[model samples]
Target: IVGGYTCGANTVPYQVSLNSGYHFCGGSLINSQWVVSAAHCYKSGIQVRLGEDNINVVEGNEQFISASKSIVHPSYNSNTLNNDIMLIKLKSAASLNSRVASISLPTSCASAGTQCLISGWGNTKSSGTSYPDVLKCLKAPILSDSSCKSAYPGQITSNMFCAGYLEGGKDSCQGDSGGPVVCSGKLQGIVSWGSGCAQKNKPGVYTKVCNYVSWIKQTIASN
Candidate 1:
C-alpha cells in the first residue's frame, strides 16, 4: 500500500524511478527542460516522473523523461552534504500540461522567517525506515538567520538555507535528500542535510537555488 502523505498533503513533490522498480525521493520540475532535484538522486539508469500521484502505476498520464545529463555542484561534499544541489537535463522538453508544469525558481535567496514547503517519499516519523510507493510532504518555516548561525555555527554557508518544523513533528528524512523546498511558490532550495529527520534543535538544510542561478544557466546552455 502507498504509505506516505499525498502530494499537496504531506508528501515530497517529485518522483524518481530507477530501472523498472527502484524508486527514490526527488524534487520538483523547475523548467520544461530542467528539473531541480538533489545531486545524490543521480544514479545509473533512472527516469523522472512529473505530475503523478501514484508511483506504482505506469500510465500515459505521467510524463516520463530520460535525463540526458546531470550536473552536481562541484564542491558537493556527501560527508557533510554541503552544496548538494543538482540538475537533471531531460533529453527533450516536457509538454506543458496542467499536472505537469515547471515550478519557478527564486530570483533571490529568501531571508529568515520565510516559510517553505518540503515533500518526499522518506520516513514519516524520525528514525523510521523509508516509505516505498508513497510520497509525503510537510511545512517548515525558514530559520532565523541568527538561529541558524548558532545552530550550524561555522557550517552555515552563504549557499545554504535552513528550514524545518519548529514544534518538531515534521522534517525531511533519509530518502528526502535532494528534494525541493518551495517558498512563495518558487523553488528556493534543494534538500541537503540536517541532524536527523525531525530533531527539535536541528533543522533540515537546503542548497539555496538563487546562489546557483548562473550555474544552472551555464549547465543548461552546455546541454
Candidate 2:
C-alpha cells in the first residue's frame, strides 16, 4: 500500500491475507466461514490468515484457516477485469474475537467523493518489491465515474470504480488485490486493478462490492 501508514493492532479485524506459501493478496471476512476477495487472486491451495497485522511475525491474534471451496463470479472477465469478485468458504468456521471478526457488507452503493479506507500489506513503493511486514492503510476518496472514465478511456466499466488521487501518490498496489475498501463501516469495494501502483490520472480501480451483495448472500445460503 503506497502512501499509507501502519495500521493499529486489530483495527481492521476483518482483514485477511490470501496465501499459499506467502501473502499474495488480501481478503475480507464476511462471516465466520466465508471470505470475499478478487477472482484474479484465486489459486489452488489458498490459506486464509485472519487477525493479521504483521506478516513476518506470529501475532497471537492470528487464525490460520484453509479454503474448502472458492467460487469466482461466473461472469468474471479477466481481460477487462469485470465482475472480479470471489467467495472463499473456509474449511472450518473462524473463532471470532476482539482481534478477529467479520465486517458488514454494504447495503447501498457508495457515491463518488466518499472517503474510504483501504488496507493491505502490498508494495510500499510504486515500482519496487518492498512489501511492508505490517499492514498499511490509506484514506482515498472515490472518484466520479466520468473522472474515472477520463483517466482510463474505454476501460472503465459499471462493475468497477476508481479511488485515489488523480494527481497521484496514494493507492493500493500489487499484492493488495482482493483487499477491502471499506466505506461507512461496510465493505464497499475490492481491490482489483489499475494502470500502475500510483500514478497521475491512474487511480486504483476496485470491484464494486455493493453490486454483488445478493450474489454473496445467495451463494452462502445455497452452498
Candidate 3:
C-alpha cells in the first residue's frame, strides 16, 4: 500500500509509492526514464506509480511504472546511513504529460540555509500514525554546512544535506524517507534520516543530489 501526498497545485514536486501496501515516503521523477528516491526505499515487491491518488488501486490520470532495476549507491551503508540515495530505472520511458512531468536536477545544489519543500504521506503530527492516503508537505530551510555540523556534530557529512525546523514540530517523519527536497523547482536532495518524528533540534537529513550528478548521469547513460 504505497502512500504519499497528492500531486496538485501548491504541493511538493514529486510522487511517491509504497511496497506491498506499505508507505516508503515520496520520490521525484528526475527524467522520463528514472525516478530518484532514497536507497532504503528500494525493497522487493515495491511498485512505483505516477499521477495516481490511491496506492491500493491505481486511480486518477497517473501512469503506473514498475522498476526494472533499482541501483542503490555503491557506498550505501544502512548502519552509518551513508550514501542513502538510489535510482529506479523504469521498464520503459514514461510519457511526458501535464500530470506526469519530470523534474530537473539541481545544477548548483543550492547552498545550505536555502529554503526548500518536502512532501510525503507520513504522520501529520509528531508521534502520530502515518496517514493512510493523504499527502502532506512542509517548508524547511536548509541548514548551513557549519550550522548543520554543529547541530548533528559528527553525524553531518559532506555528502548529506540538512533541512527542518530547529524547534521541531514540522518535519519529514518515518514514511517520508526517500522523498525529494525541492528548491526552486529542482531536486537538490533526498530525505534520508531524522532523529525521530518531529523532534526538537533534530532536522531531517538528505542525500545531496548535486554531489552525485556525474555518477547519476553516467549510470543513466550506461543503463
Top-scoring candidate (TM-score): 2
Q: For model 1, where is the 10-residue window of minimal lDDT?
A: 9-18
Candidate 1 lDDT over residue span 55-161, tens digit each: 67654557778877777778877666667778887777877666676777777888777877777666666665656454566667788756766767788788787
Better of 1 and 2 by lDDT: 2
Q: What would you estimate as the lDDT of candidate 1?
A: 0.68
Root-mean-square deviation per candidate: 3.2, 0.7, 3.0
Model 2: per-residue lDDT, tens digit, 1-223? Answer: 8898888878999999998999999999999999999999989899999999998899799999999999999999998999999999999999999888999999999999999999999898987768999899999999999999999999989999999999888999998999999999999999999988888889999999999999999999988
Candidate 2: stretches off by over 4 Å: none
Per-model lDDT = 0.68, 0.93, 0.73
TM-score order of candidates, top first: 2, 3, 1
Compare candidates 2 and 3 on TM-score and give the better one.
2
Candidate 3 lDDT over residue span 1-223, tens digit each: 1122344432432565545456565678788879888887878665667664555554566666777888998888887677888898888777867766777888777886788877766666676575646556677888877766777889877889778777877778777778778888878888888777677877788888888888788898898
Q: Give the CA lDDT, 0 to 100, for residue 191 in model 3.
A: 83
- Give the TM-score of each candidate: 0.86, 0.98, 0.89
